[PDB]
Amino acid sequence: VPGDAGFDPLTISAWLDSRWLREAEIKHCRVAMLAAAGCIAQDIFQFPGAKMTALHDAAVKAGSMGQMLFWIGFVEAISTAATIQMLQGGRARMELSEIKNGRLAMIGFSGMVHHYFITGKGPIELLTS
């Protein structure tokens, strides 16, 4: 029910659980929120001792992404218990703000990453040039 512009042109809602769809969308929203803000954050400032897409593989060799994967994997296991227990059975503005900025983050992150393919640069780095 939140963020309902009557926009389901392909009618996916008819052949998959609305609870599953909303959970997947909000998870995608929040992941892309973190990813897009992080992508702009790296060009703004750098953590000590530490670009868009190849830095994934610059980080895996240290074991950073592997460690992050382990902790996301742990949380996602308790969260798969969460979604299964969801499925087997002044704030509404804020939920809609979250979902709207999250859809925007998905567009934004897609833009930044394909901008990397175009120019080998991060988002605001290219914006500056």
Partner: protein, 170 residues
Amino acid sequence: DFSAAVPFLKRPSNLDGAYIGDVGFDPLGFSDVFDLRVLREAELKHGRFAMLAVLGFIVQELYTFPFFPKMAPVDAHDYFVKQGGGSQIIFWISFVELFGVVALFETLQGKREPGDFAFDPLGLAKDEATLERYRLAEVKHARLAMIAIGGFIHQYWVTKQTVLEQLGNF
């Protein structure tokens, strides 16, 4: 109702505050399948082993017996595999675990709490209230020491420094 620990996870339903230390954390639902008395016996047994192990580390760096060589606790495992005292400890643990098998049958047959061996030589447990707090503290320490154990052994492997010397350095 919802789990006390994980707000968004539902309560398991085989975990209805029956045992002390129950915060409803059971996502895999092993208590929906397996006997919770068996699981609690294992929880306390694994935890008591872990507590004796973490202390075992700490004291073994601080002191070692004069008749035994000075060395690191993992090196002690391998030395006492080949020396003979490891089999000693394994035999006597296994001996006690025989009467532990009888104890677990007594628990399954309804006549014993899962970790209760009536081991109160120093009479520290006084009445019901202090005993409930003591066993809550025992469960919390047992879980924490299980976590701790992984850290000391794994960290020694990654960096060949003992737990106290690793705090001392870096």
